[PDB]
Amino acid sequence: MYTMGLDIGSTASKGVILKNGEDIVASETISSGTGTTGPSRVLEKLYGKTGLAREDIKKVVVTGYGRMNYSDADKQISELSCHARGVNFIIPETRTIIDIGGQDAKVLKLDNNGRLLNFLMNDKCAAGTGRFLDVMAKIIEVDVSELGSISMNSQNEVSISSTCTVFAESEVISHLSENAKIEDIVAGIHTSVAKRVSSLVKRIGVQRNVVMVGGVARNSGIVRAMAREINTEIIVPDIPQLTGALGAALYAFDEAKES
Amino acid sequence: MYTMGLDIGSTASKGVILKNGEDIVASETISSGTGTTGPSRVLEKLYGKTGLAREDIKKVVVTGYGRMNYSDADKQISELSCHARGVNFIIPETRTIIDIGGQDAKVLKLDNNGRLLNFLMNDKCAAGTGRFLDVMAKIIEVDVSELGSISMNSQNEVSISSTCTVFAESEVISHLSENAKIEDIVAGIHTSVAKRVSSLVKRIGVQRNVVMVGGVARNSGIVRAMAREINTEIIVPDIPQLTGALGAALYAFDEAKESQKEVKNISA
Numbered sequence: 001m002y003t004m005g006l007d008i009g010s011t012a013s014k015g016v017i018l019k020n021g022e023d024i025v026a027s028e029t030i031s032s033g034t035g036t037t038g039p040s041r042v043l044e045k046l047y048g049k050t051g052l053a054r055e056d057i058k059k060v061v062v063t064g065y066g067r068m069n070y071s072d073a074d075k076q077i078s079e080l081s082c083h084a085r086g087v088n089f090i091i092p093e094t095r096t097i098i099d100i101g102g103q104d105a106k107v108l109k110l111d112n113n114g115r116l117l118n119f120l121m122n123d124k125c126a127a128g129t130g131r132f133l134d135v136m137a138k139i140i141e142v143d144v145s146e147l148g149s150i151s152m153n154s155q156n157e158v159s160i161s162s163t164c165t166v167f168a169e170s171e172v173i174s175h176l177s178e179n180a181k182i183e184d185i186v187a188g189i190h191t192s193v194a195k196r197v198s199s200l201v202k203r204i205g206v207q208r209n210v211v212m213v214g215g216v217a218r219n220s221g222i223v224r225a226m227a228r229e230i231n232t233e234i235i236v237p238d239i240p241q242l243t244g245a246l247g248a249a250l251y252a253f254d255e256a257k258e259s
Numbered sequence: 260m261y262t263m264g265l266d267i268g269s270t271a272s273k274g275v276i277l278k279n280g281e282d283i284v285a286s287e288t289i290s291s292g293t294g295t296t297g298p299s300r301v302l303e304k305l306y307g308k309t310g311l312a313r314e315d316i317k318k319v320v321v322t323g324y325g326r327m328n329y330s331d332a333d334k335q336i337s338e339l340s341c342h343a344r345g346v347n348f349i350i351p352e353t354r355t356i357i358d359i360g361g362q363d364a365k366v367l368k369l370d371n372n373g374r375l376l377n378f379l380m381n382d383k384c385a386a387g388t389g390r391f392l393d394v395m396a397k398i399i400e401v402d403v404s405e406l407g408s409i410s411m412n413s414q415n416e417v418s419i420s421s422t423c424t425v426f427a428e429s430e431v432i433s434h435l436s437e438n439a440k441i442e443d444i445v446a447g448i449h450t451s452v453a454k455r456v457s458s459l460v461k462r463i464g465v466q467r468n469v470v471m472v473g474g475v476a477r478n479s480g481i482v483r484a485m486a487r488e489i490n491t492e493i494i495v496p497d498i499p500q501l502t503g504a505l506g507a508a509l510y511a512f513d514e515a516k517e518s519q520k521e522v523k524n525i526s527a
């Protein structure tokens with residue numbers, strides 16, 4: 001039996017085909033979100049990768065910012081619910097989930113059943129989201145996928161004074177003009193993001209286990225900086241960007257059984 | 260006697276030479292601010308215009324973000340004080356001053372003596388400042404100096420949902436690709452700034468007369484949107500970007516008069 005989960009976010013589309021509600025047999029991420037062909041391309045690839053087709057998929061659930069714009073799913077479900085479900089599937093005793101995506105940062109507090117108890121989100125400021133990193137990566141002319149590894153080489157982190165993405169961009173341009181080492185600039189960029197999200201997490205009250213998800217959690221430098229700022233161990237799935245899609249796939253499995 | 264005021268902000272350098280504390284005989288704005296050659300260029304132009312030299316200026320006061328980086332002044336004075344002094348010299352009965360500059364927006368409430376009663380500033384965020392406008396002007400490919408006139412033609416302003424400069428830029432890009440009328444895009448951009456600064460004004464409590472200063476006050480579209488959002492008439496000086504430098508020049512005059520009053524001049 002197979003179900004599918006689709007998470008169409010501001011920035012990327014993620015898909016998972018789940019086997020018997022327990023085994024991920026295919027996952028795919030396309031860095032095109034709401035308002036693009038990203039969803040279609042994710043599907044194409046999940047199908048090519050598995051050999052399956054739409055007919056073989058008993059239930060599909062879509063989540064994320066673009067979920068109501070998608071008309072080919074059995075249910076459209078909140079990404080708060082889907083990320084919580086996906087994380088709880090992988091990591092026991094999760095009480096705090098930090099989802100840093102392309103346009104917002106979400107912090108979920110869960111009870112002992114995995115149900116939402118409290119929630120705080122920054123969705124109004126590009127700083128402390130993936131958008132900040134995307135902007136900086138473009139200026140430094142490296143892929144966001146390299147920022148973690150680059151920051152590892154830092155021995156003399158540059159401080160970024162500005163908390164605003166726009167003002168920070170100017171600072172980074174100025175550091176680049178002063179021939180600051182790219183690894184130190186990037187380390188400072190990671191610290192800026194971690195300070196802004198950490199403030200968010202501290203307002204809700206850290207409770208272990210603390211789990212980071214979202215595409216930004218693929219950046220090892222951000223995760224390290226975050227664990228430093230919140231002074232708590234952070235657990236990151238090997239598939240942090242796909243937890244919403246996985247959670248959708250699990251709700252899809254619930255639907256398929258109910259049928 | 261002549262005195263000089265320099266206002267070295269984040270974005271532009273402004274200078275005024277004032278004669279006998281009453282007549283502006285020269286002014287100059289260069290769109291390079293702190294950390295640049297802006298200040299030296301301002302000086303060159305004031306001196307060129309007037310045919311004066313440093314030795315002819317009795318007192319110099321510097322203000323603005325860059326004031327402490329400047330070492331050739333007699334005093335370095337707060338830009339809150341300098342804008343208030345400059346505005347009060349030009350516009351009687353002023354009680355609210357809105358200074359929208361290149362990196363922050365300041366709202367000053369003054370008492371009946373021109374002294375600061377209350378103050379709010381948005382300073383950490385590019386939105387609601389000249390930076391926001393400079394960013395948008397670049398994207399829509401018009402000069403910031405044309406925004407005011409363009410916006411006059413708007414009849415159905417576009418919506419900008421985002422309050423963040425970065426997210427708003429993406430909306431403006433989308434509007435341009437959707438072929439929305441430029442004047443309606445510009446009106447929406449103005450409304451974004453005005454909503455953000457008007458929230459500060461409303462928090463402090465609007466009190467007439469309300470005066471707008473700073474380089475952004477040269478944008479008539481921002482002035483109109485602000486007056487709309489605060490539901491109050493706004494007065495703009497003829498030289499809104501220069502009120503800080505004027506205030507500095509007036510404090511410089513005060514210094515000069517203080518020096519004169521501490522001696523006696525005896526002749527027969």
Ligand SMILES: Nc1ncnc2c1ncn2[C@@H]1O[C@H](COP(=O)(O)OP(=O)(O)NP(=O)(O)O)[C@@H](O)[C@H]1O
Nearest residue numbers: 009010011012101102103104130145214215216219
């Ligand atoms: N390989 C990578 N390494 C590090 N960071 C990455 C990588 N790929 C993407 N990112 C970051 O991940 C972000 C997108 O994460 P993602 O969780 O897919 O956002 P989204 O769900 O589309 N947006 P939202 O609506 O905010 O949830 C981008 O903005 C990048 O900064």
Ligand SMILES: Nc1ncnc2c1ncn2[C@@H]1O[C@H](COP(=O)(O)OP(=O)(O)NP(=O)(O)O)[C@@H](O)[C@H]1O
Nearest residue numbers: 268269270271360361362363389404473474475478
């Ligand atoms: N001719 C013009 N028409 C409309 N707007 C203008 C014009 N010239 C400059 N501006 C705006 O005015 C700005 C700078 O204003 P100004 O008050 O000189 O800032 P500043 O004092 O250097 N910075 P701050 O440190 O924040 O006070 C730019 O960011 C522009 O948006």
Ligand code: SF4
Nearest residue numbers: 125164165384423424
């Ligand atoms: S601080 Fe900068 S990044 Fe944050 S909302 Fe303001 S303009 Fe956007």
Ligand SMILES: [Mg+2]
Nearest residue numbers: 009064101244
């Ligand atoms: Mg997401």
Ligand SMILES: [Mg+2]
Nearest residue numbers: 268323360503
């Ligand atoms: Mg100023």
Ligand code: NA
Nearest residue numbers: 239240241242
């Ligand atoms: Na992943």
Ligand code: NA
Nearest residue numbers: 270271290474
């Ligand atoms: Na200017």
Ligand code: NA
Nearest residue numbers: 498499500501
């Ligand atoms: Na002016």
